[PDB]
Amino acid sequence: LFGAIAGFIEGGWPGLINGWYGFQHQNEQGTGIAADKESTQKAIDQITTKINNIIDKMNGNYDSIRGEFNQVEKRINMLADRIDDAVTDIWSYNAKLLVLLENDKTLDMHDANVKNLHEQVRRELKDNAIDEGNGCFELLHKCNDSCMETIRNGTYDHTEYAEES
Amino acid sequence: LFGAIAGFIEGGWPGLINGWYGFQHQNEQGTGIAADKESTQKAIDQITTKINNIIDKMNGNYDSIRGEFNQVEKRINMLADRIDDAVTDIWSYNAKLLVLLENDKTLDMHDANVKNLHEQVRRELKDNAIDEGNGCFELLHKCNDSCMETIRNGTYDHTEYAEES
Amino acid sequence: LFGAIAGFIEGGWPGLINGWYGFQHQNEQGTGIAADKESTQKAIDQITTKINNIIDKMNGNYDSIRGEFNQVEKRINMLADRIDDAVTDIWSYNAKLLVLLENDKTLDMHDANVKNLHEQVRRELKDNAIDEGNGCFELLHKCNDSCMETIRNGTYDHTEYAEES
Amino acid sequence: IQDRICVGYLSTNSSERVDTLLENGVPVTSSIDLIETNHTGTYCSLNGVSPVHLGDCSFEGWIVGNPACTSNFGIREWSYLIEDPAAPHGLCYPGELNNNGELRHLFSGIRSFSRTELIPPTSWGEVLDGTTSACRDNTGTNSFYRNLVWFIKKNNRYPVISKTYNNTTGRDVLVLWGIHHPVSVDETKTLYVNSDPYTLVSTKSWSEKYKLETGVRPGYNGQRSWMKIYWSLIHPGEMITFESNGGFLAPRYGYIIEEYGKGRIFQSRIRMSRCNTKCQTSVGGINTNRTFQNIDKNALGDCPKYIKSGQLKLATGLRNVPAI
Amino acid sequence: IQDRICVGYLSTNSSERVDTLLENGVPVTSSIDLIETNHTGTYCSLNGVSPVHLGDCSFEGWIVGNPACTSNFGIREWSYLIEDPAAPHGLCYPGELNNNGELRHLFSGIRSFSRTELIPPTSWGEVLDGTTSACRDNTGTNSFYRNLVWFIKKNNRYPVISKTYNNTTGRDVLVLWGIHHPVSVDETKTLYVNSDPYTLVSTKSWSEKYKLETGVRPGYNGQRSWMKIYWSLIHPGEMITFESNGGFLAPRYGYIIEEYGKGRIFQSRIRMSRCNTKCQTSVGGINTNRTFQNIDKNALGDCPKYIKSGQLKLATGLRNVPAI
Amino acid sequence: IQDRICVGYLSTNSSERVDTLLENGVPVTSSIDLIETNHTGTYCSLNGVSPVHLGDCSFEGWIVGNPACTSNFGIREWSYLIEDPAAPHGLCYPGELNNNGELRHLFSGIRSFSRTELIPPTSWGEVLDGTTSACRDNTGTNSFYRNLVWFIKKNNRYPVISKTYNNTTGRDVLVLWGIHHPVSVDETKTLYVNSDPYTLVSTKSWSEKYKLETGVRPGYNGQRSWMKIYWSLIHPGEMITFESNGGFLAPRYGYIIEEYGKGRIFQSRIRMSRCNTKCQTSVGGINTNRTFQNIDKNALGDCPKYIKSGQLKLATGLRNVPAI
């Protein structure tokens, strides 16, 4: 666990459209919600690859292990059924455990992704902002609608603002 | 790995009672050890759920794959034994690997938990404390026994102290 | 993911000899590349242990499940082949998934290792350096070739330099 | 106040929950099902290949050609078989099919099938064809199994008859013959004249000699004697010879088979349909891209693996933690 | 100095160690064992159901009713069987039980069992009961198998005897009969008068005819002839008829069985006990909530899976790193 | 500017790529292969033990001692067998080996093997040895199977011959005998004088009686009669007795075997070699420390597990992300 989701960012945003991770701003001229297509798409690609891998790699033969028997060959009939059942028990346990294991990792992956996004924004601003410890950043200078975009697209330069701080 | 356990917090605390993670303080009036029931219980619940999942999901039939045979049906007897042995080999490898895999994740989970606790305290204090980089925080102001509790229970407010710093 | 490799440290170093993780310095008297034998060897030991565990634990019997049959015992011949095939399908899926799972964890382990190394250096310097947010540290004081070594070997003391900053 | 920018994550209106290794019932924004639970509830074609319903006949009666059964003369292939466990028709004349378990297994599903005439029914010599009230046809006329010919005395004489078959088809050929065991030595005299008749069947790898086992059986229909029907797979280039002087159900029709034992004999009392799936169960057809299924352990074809489990939800979204 | 607060973790006095994928022998504060290594070392009841010890008798002698064996008349059920591999008693009269492997498998464990009299031993006709010095009872008196009756000539005449059994029990019924092969045609004359006697056994699905195979066998006890004992499972609503004029060991006692083949025939020389476990091995009973066990691959019931492994320790606590 | 120190990681010149669960084709600095893909392409010794090539003979002809086959008298052991599927030599005299499937399985690989003389070929009594043009030896002289002796009439008389074997070897012993079925009752008279001859074979656990089944078979070579060869494993301390008055292929040579069924009968047309591996496939020998292999599902010995997969690359290094 990475301490972001349900951690220091204690809640989610309903009305976050077409994205898992995003930004919420407020300058003198409004608000102010947008998904981060970069980290969201990359996350979407990973989940898709994971799901496809889990399914596509099962390319073997999985129908029943059984044959036809008359009523005089009960023993061989019972062994066939027991073996089919045993193979079934192996797949049953692995299926359940894999889902538990991967759900664990999927949730933590998302936690890691928004934490990395938060760290990414913190590194941009440097001393030009106060880290409120809740996912928010208080700017020490004024920020255009254009300025907010430079933060969102990673191109924010802390030198061209350091003095109003 | 998260760098806390056996990392920047280079040692554990013997005499930490009824908890895995906790606090050690020292003000003018004493010391000063207490478990964090919140993060400890949550960790206990997770380990319990993990252990139970591993065991409870094995709800199939796991006794021997074998039958009764006379001394004239050796081949079918040998195939039954080989199949039972093969099923046994699958479970043997999965058991060993799962324990190795999960022990890895359990240890790192604990590492992550105390790291998140450390980060949680650091966010509380903000500029009111110096981060010594060893799990300790040096307060810039005085701290009551009451003040220490507000830090331990998350309700510490950095505004009501920022000026003595 | 830990955000270091291909993250805030956006590129690798060709000409990093005998190591996975290392340092690049520049003082008045040169440059300046060296592996960190400590964290590199520890990482090497872990990968080696992982690889050996994966291979050494497969100590069962894995040759074919089959017997000899004449042309009048087709059914038992077909069941033997189907069972052998089924056992093969279990190992096939587990092999593919384990490699995918472990490659995921190996890459993230490396990411975690250099992130921990970066954090380790940041804790040493404290206020004696500016964190540029790209894996580099700008020293506020002058640094001997000897001084660089004290940083690399962990023994750098921020008190014996804090004043030139 | 000041300008501010915040980092956050998605929250939705979902009751969707998944279990993780460390936690039960965790709210998530989105998830998928791993296990297929839906089926047609019918017998479908399997990957373009229709099955064969056996109607009111058991497999035994169908494979030897019980006159009351629909003929298998026009069949080219089948993915699986559908059989009624309480089928009224089987071996119409009191008897047993030897090694029927194996035969059932080999005929569960065949990709290339065609009936063929091994030996001409009149090329045997001086013998008559026997029909019986036990094996009446669709009309009501006395008949007998289509694949066998019941040879009896002609003009008070049963000569030593001997014909052989040469597998020239290039594929495996199923051959059927039979032995009739009369109620008494008097009946084998009435039917075959010869005292203590025999039948000798041989290839170049094996040879069997059959004699008659006279006695009264607690039979069915009208008869009280007993028939034993045997079979053998003749491989490409192999030959089987039949020689007999009585009590011999001679081979007429055999089967040319390729890629067999690939099916199943379903006995489930569900309905046949026009649908087509890649996986057939005894409960219905399954058509899904999912790799698991908890519907029926009895399944055939390109199937999801059957597992003993409730639905399994794979998390795709993130933890659904409500709005601040 | 100043006021200070620190974050830390638990350390203990443990030598407890676990292995991880990345590291061997890592100190931890607490851990649990996954594999069960403890057992009773005895034969216990399995899930409330007691087994059956065969005493000094092999399964063959027990199932046909060797007079020296303890009777199975009072048995209602058994979870498994206990057999001494070097048991002195078996088929007391020189003979073999046909297809005994299958029978052993089907009788390894039965949930519903009861002996029953198929056909009255005196309802057969004009024949005497034969006893022998080879099959003496608990007293020392000449006897014979409990489940079979050795029919011989009465008043120098062996008539054609014929009785049939009707399975009305609603469950599967095991039936046993036998053929006696005398040392010479002289002995079959002395015993059965009739030259070349036969036995015909039939249902509505199959029919077998037995003749005598005279000769001297390298036998045991007193005798030098040979017996062959056969068996068949009669399904609910089925009937089996026996007709013979000599050399026939007639059925008397059969077995009504439901839910069978659910057991095991243990041959281990351990002791029977008053304990009750959910898993029985050839080495002892196991009672544990653990899902793995490295004790014995030979196990029956609600067991932990046997694996080839030393103890496996699951970490619960954290890395035990000592105090600063 | 100022003094500076940086933290970084390794980059290389690699096209090396691995797949992860979350991403395809990720560049890495180093990786290893899990699956063995290389083999010798030959038949090798298996863990120090050489196999046995059957030359131009099938297993059946080899195990009974076809004179045209190389003798197995000097063999001590074998890891596996090599057989040509279209081998010209087998049962030289028209016949079949009973239960040959089981025997093939039991003789696929034996750790302790030695031929031995069960009963002296002249200790039987007043009978002659029969040789035939069907079973000529390496020279061209009429002979017969090495392990069997074809007993015929001597001085117009075939006496009742009876010899027995005592398993004193302490190990399992394979015994072979046979029955000859002449073309007519005239031929059994010419060969054995006695009308309707018999053969009785017995242990203390079982007894079989064989009679002759006269008739003309569509044979090969010169002959038109038929032989049936049977076998039995005699356990330590057990004895088998043979009694006959004609039509009897008597046992001469048997086999003392320990640790058997541990092999395979390879029919692959590859070449035998001087190499030695721990895993033999029908395609070649494998020598690797890797635990997986995608070469051949048909494998024997201390093998990597066969899996249906392309090469699997385990990442060891880190993500290879190029220089800033």
Ligand SMILES: *[C@@H]1O[C@H](CO)[C@@H](O)[C@H](O)[C@H]1NC(C)=O
């Ligand atoms: C069919 O069998 C006969 C009998 O010998 C043989 O001559 C002929 O070659 C066989 N047919 C073929 C295709 O060879």
